[PDB]
Amino acid sequence: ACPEDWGASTSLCFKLYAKGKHEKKTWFESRDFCRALGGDLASINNKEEQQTIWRLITASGSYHKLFWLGLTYGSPSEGFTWSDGSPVSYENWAYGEPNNYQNVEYCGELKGDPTMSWNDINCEHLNNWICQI
Numbered sequence: 442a443c444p445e446d447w448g449a450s451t452s453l454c455f456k457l458y459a460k461g462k463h464e465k466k467t468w469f470e471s472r473d474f475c476r477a478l479g480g481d482l483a484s485i486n487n488k489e490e491q492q493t494i495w496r497l498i499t500a501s502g503s504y505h506k507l508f509w510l511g512l513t514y515g516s517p518s519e520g521f522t523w524s525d526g527s528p529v530s531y532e533n534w535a536y537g538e539p540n541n542y543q544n545v546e547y548c549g550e551l552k553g554d555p556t557m558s559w560n561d562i563n564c565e566h567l568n569n570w571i572c573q574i
């Protein structure tokens with residue numbers, strides 16, 4: 442059971458926020474937006490959660506879009522973490538990622554195509570985002 446307009450059409454209550462360029466957000470702004478609603482940026486802990494999100498993407502009819510996930514670099518010994526505190530065990534990094542390109546990439550984004558792959562990118566980029574509750 443999810444709140445109205447969340448989850449499919451854990452309780453798997455993910456929600457896509459696809460936005461035009463004047464409404465996209467940095468990673469921190471997206472984290473704060475999802476947390477203000479009582480949730481967090483989406484963590485993808487297994488293939489079932491990945492399928493839930495992919496199916497929501499297909500229903501919105503817009504492909505290839507980039508979305509912030511809850512991926513954020515921790516300490517050097519931790520590497521990438523989920524903002525919700527869950528362990529990063531399941532991974533779906535794109536080929537060669539995370540690559541910390543130019544040493545400035547400390548947040549993770551989802552490429553909303555069938556591969557559902559993750560890429561590290563600069564946290565101050567403006568992206569779409571996905572929340573969970």
Ligand SMILES: CO[C@H]1O[C@H](CO)[C@@H](O)[C@H](O)[C@@H]1O
Nearest residue numbers: 538540542546560561562563
């Ligand atoms: C040029 O940088 C972009 O492409 C590389 C892969 O080539 C990514 O790792 C990086 O995060 C950027 O999206």
Ligand SMILES: [Ca+2]
Nearest residue numbers: 540542560561
């Ligand atoms: Ca990268």
